[PDB]
């Protein structure tokens, strides 16, 4: 319900922020497995499914405080920051050339060859908005009991295995909304742009690109970018690269951090 | 229909979801899945049990009440929702190293079949089957005794998608000889261990205007949405496999069109 | 050597035709395995190679009779139908979601899993022309003895395993020109547009798309579409989806029919 | 060459084919194939026999005879790998999908695709570069002898030109990006041995050969130089012996008369 | 740098960087790593020198020329020697090893292809798979980098100032810096992945930023960097080594007036 008016265009009308989101794969920060999940355990049935904390990835999010542009918030019009473009890069793609660190080998029976490296599912998504990303709760198995550390809808019922219009949330906190339990809500997010790709498998080769030359335009079909409510820019992502497999065949998620550059301009809006 | 001028009050937007109809009933523990797939020994004794195969999803959306005016669908967004759930490799899945009782679950793998249709009347179907001798269950809507020509194109074997969750995906497809008033789109990747590849964004708008600049015209002020979204197979520890589906989001923008 | 003159415009100037071509994978029409080849047998050497009839696919073709637009064919100029655009779709893709019909199972040793469905090579091609598709004879093994039912160059010699400028033909008949022995001739086909893709393997997943929204322009670099000599529109195709594998490991080609919509306009030509 | 006005019968089109040179002799039963590939135990005793490895195809096309002089300028091309249809053959003496059961189709052609072509007004300029510098190439092949360890990466001394058909090994020579000012080249490599081959064909694709300055290859000696290599994969026999399989390439080239300073 | 107008005025350079996969130049395995060994745990992880690839880099001296600077406006780049990967006879594990039959498997596995063109050294972010890895003395790394180095730590910076000693697995381009460099990278992982490479002399990449300004060559130096891991070479005894290829650079520069 924001009435959008004129773009401002002077030499001081554009700002740029840069930010990083570290991955939240499960293992705690400042400890030896930071960037990984704990070794994944698998239930015998849907009824007894209770994934332990640290064994599954959660979304990354941050609110970036922008310069406050309005001396008087009672004026007939105010300025808001409008996100018009971004650059985003998955960082540390270089580290995936490591095939020597405690990895199951290509020829395990012969105790020979390189490590198999990271392989399996890729889940890469990011979102840029003027308010938190709007979520739809949806799970593979509704009878999964998520641990206390996680933010989920408890006892969500059978309808949560597909679309249930009751089961909404917002990405309000870093490292607690499980990736497997929440996704972007296309019924909402009028003030956010999101982008995602899933490549499944457990032996799938990761495919990643990185360049500082690619800009994505964030303007909608009315030429309006995300408008930063309360001078807040919301960045969200998940970057599951695949799995790390140990000699003893235990497997963990590996994630990478994401870079964001967002170019914003001053937009007059009705107040 | 004699189509005259675009009117300009004059624009409306609708949003809808279609849940998948993979075979297991709603409001029960396996909703979103088929029942475990059984395989016949030969084409002559081929009776796929009810709940073991996916069916099309469909709905008619009631549009606001209205020479006549008709709602003309000019653009859409669509999205397969719940892609996020496929990051689950812990729920009762055959493991990567089953012989060692070790590794993640293998997750959902195998065939992707993704189709959607938006029109001003029900989707017109062409009946076509892998094996014409398959005996479909009573619950399913099929052409009985369709004959050998139903394994390829037979101009006689027509239908319309009039009901949700009963038209088998494996027996019906969009009819390219009809559907002048519907746009449809479909992608198929086969296999049983194929990596699923799904994308999601809110930045993709598809224009529904034909070559004459005319969108689907909503007969009886009804907008017809149809889809099927098979994501792949769920494999249990005991190697039983079932279809897994996901729900689809629709946004359609419509405008008032004057017609004769 | 047709001298092309003015395009006719106006409400009488365009016609649209729709047609289907059923696949010719080997098994006879109106019998239980229509849409399939017979089970593929494999030779022990190139010298003894003699593929039986029904075991290999052939090209589909039709000549569509167009409205006869000229009352007098002796006039200094006549009208010809000129194909300017087409839509084409592989029909029946829906059927490949069948993994229950007598298929080798994913876990055959456990008698468990879905069927493996249709997997392996995809060969998809179509042509639209004002005359028969012009062909180049070319074979994997020149010593192959084709059955009497098939149209081939007999005793073609070693040069037929690569390009031999002598080994020309035209796609004059339906369901008899083996796919594996004939391909489009890029030296000819001035009045035909053809398009093809091959994806090999026997375990390769089929990849097919279908929509009623995709139009292919058929005008050449001079703005001239295929001109229908004698009011005949030539449609050709092959749509090998992959193989059907039985429980006993016998394998057969599976094909699908193709839809054509062709938009034609009246073109004046010299006569 | 100082380039002046386009003098545009100012236009000519040529068509040609280059048969592959996979190793087995022409006019004999395995034409299009290599001989069955043998693998060495180590880099120090590595001598790939003649016929077991592919070589580049090349031809010079004689064009219509012609202060300043006229030269033919190639402005566009079509090219096509022909015979893609033959790869639907899964019956000709092929290892079977279920060999232990003596059942299934043949496995067909699978493995690496190496597809390159070049169109120039002089021979394609080459850079010598090899997997293993100690490989002993056969007498039939054109190689740099004793090329040194440098030749496993870039060495500026190790140059050649593609002057003859069917004798420059693909695995020892590639296009030189430091040269080829008067040639356009294009290449694609997909590796492996069981990789699915992917090939397309159409007569609706034309490639523009003009450079940044709007000049196409100028045909020195009124000669048009066509080169290629089209490895589609490996043929596997019942006894697991493997051989390269190649396909011929079509070229159409449109040329116009260009005035140049003599 | 305050950038004024585009100012005889154009120059072109060509260069190659040979790969630094680990085995020494002018010896029989130039282009390869040594055979890769694998640790039993993250705690005892000490990759020997020559078993892992490092970045290649060179500074190109530009012609002697408010001030004027050289501004890189376009490049061509190509991975050379793609032709050599058609070799399936040179001491490779056979397709049917049990039968001592078939071609060699050739080069297979991970592709890492990155290049950068700049007016100063490439700015690096340190990031490693396993922070407890002990890199050998020959390598340039951050010693005892801590758990934060397994993801993004803003304290863990370098610049690519030396050829063949910055491990690819420890350094990547820093998106927080590199305002005067253009970098491009693609990774495809796995150990049995088919390599996919293209080559042509018909592709030119524009190096101008959103303000129409290319890399400005500080001290009249042009900085070229790359890593081109094509995949692994597998011997009959299943030992595996990195295989790299050299990269070609063409760069077009123009004279630019700056304050
Ligand atoms: C053991 C197992 O995996 N059970 C799963 C169950 O499979 C059975 C089910 O698919 C039925 C059809 O509804 O078919 C088979 O059971 C038959 C018979 O129908 C049943 O009554 C008897 O118990 O055993 C028979 C042979 O097993 C399948 O085993 O399916 C459910 C979903 O419907 C769950 O997946 C359950 O884990
Ligand atoms: C058995 C078989 O597959 N035969 C095929 C034949 O393979 C031989 C061929 O590749 C030659 C080199 O020209 O090498 C091997 O044969 C050697 C020797 O050269 C030969 O004279 C002797 O009889 O056998 C030896 C091996 O023990 C290969 O077996 O090659 C042709 C193609 O050239 C056919 O593929 C034939 O089926
Ligand atoms: C023996 C081994 O691989 N140990 C792992 C260790 O695995 C643990 C698992 O065996 C079980 O005991 O649960 C705990 C939960 O924290 C561990 O997952 O995990 C650590 C990293 O967490 C490391 O991978 C060891 O090598
Ligand atoms: C037992 C079996 O799988 N039968 C197949 C049948 O195979 C036949 C083959 O075994 C041999 O006898 O030759 C004939 C040639 O016409 C058959 O190929 O084939 C039919 C299909 O025609 C069917 O697949 C049976 O199940
Ligand atoms: K930006
Ligand atoms: K819309
Ligand atoms: K024969
Ligand atoms: K041409
Ligand atoms: K350049
Ligand atoms: Mg909404
Ligand atoms: Mg119609
Ligand atoms: Mg011709
Ligand atoms: Mg040069
Ligand atoms: Mg910066």
Author numbering:
A (entry chain DDD): 24 to 294
B (entry chain CCC): 22 to 29, 32 to 89, 97 to 290
C (entry chain BBB): 21 to 291
D (entry chain AAA): 22 to 29, 32 to 89, 96 to 291
E (entry chain EEE): 22 to 28, 32 to 89, 97 to 290
The publication says:
Here, glycan array screening shows that the major capsid protein VP1 of sheep polyomavirus (ShPyV) binds to the Forssman glycolipid, an antigen of many vertebrates and a potential tumor marker in humans. Thus, our studies present the first example of a polyomavirus VP1 protein interacting with a non-sialyl neutral glycan, complementing the principles of how polyomaviruses recognize their targets.
We also solved the crystal structure of VP1 in complex with the FA glycan precursor, globo-*N*-tetraose, which reveals negligible binding only. A dominance of the terminal GalNAcα1-3GalNAcβ Forssman disaccharide is apparent as the VP1 did not give binding signals with globoside glycolipid (P-antigen, position 25, [Table tbl1]), the precursor of the Forssman glycolipid which lacks the terminal α-linked GalNAc residue.
